[PDB]
Design a protein around this ligand. Structure first.
Ligand code: HEM
Length: 154
């Protein structure tokens, strides 16, 4: 699959707004993920013990991981599909060290779309959401292919 330049522009336009507050979006996205799919929280040994949203909002460790995740995703999106080099180390750590199934990448993709829809209605209309979904689908498809090559695929 391949996105058009127009689709990439819609993706990068809303991402530019996300970059105005990376830490804030990072918290919102991870917390959305953990509330919608509690099982994903078990993968984060640092704060698997958090019980409530209030505790999650106060966690500096969660906020830092959110920034790290979004910054890595932003770098990938900015490559507009030419992200082979960026995906290699990410695929290896998440497949071999963290053991993150593709299902969880789908879950976080859903959280990203939910938060952008909530915080940026003016720049996340139907066409923009479709472009973002297409970009995330491409990311998941390529990461899944790498998982397979690495011996994980799951
Ligand atoms: C948007 C997709 C994601 C991106 C771009 C991303 C990016 C990153 C980055 C850059 C790191 C630090 C370097 C590394 O270990 O590779 C990291 C660590 C990690 N990621 Fe992801 N990640 C994503 C999704 C997920 C998901 C869905 C989970 C599991 C629910 C997850 C769990 C972890 C864990 C457990 C760590 C290690 C944290 C620690 O113990 O310090 N990641 N991720």
């Amino acid at each position: 699959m391949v996105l058009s330049e127009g689709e990439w522009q819609l993706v990068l336009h809303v991402w530019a707004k996300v970059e105005a507050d990376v830490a804030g979006h990072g918290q919102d996205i991870l917390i959305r993920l953990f509330k919608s799919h509690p099982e994903t929280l078990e993968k984060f040994d640092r704060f698997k013990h958090l019980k409530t949203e209030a505790e999650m909002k106060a966690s500096e460790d969660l906020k830092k991981d959110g920034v790290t995740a979004l910054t890595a995703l932003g770098a990938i999106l900015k490559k507009k599909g030419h992200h082979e080099a960026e995906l290699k180390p990410l695929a290896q750590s998440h497949a071999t060290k963290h053991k993150i199934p593709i299902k969880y990448l789908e879950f976080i993709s859903e959280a990203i779309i939910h938060v952008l829809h909530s915080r940026h209605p003016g720049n996340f209309g139907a066409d923009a959401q479709g472009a973002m979904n297409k970009a995330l689908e491409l990311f998941r498809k390529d990461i899944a292919a790498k998982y397979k090559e690495l011996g994980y695929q799951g």
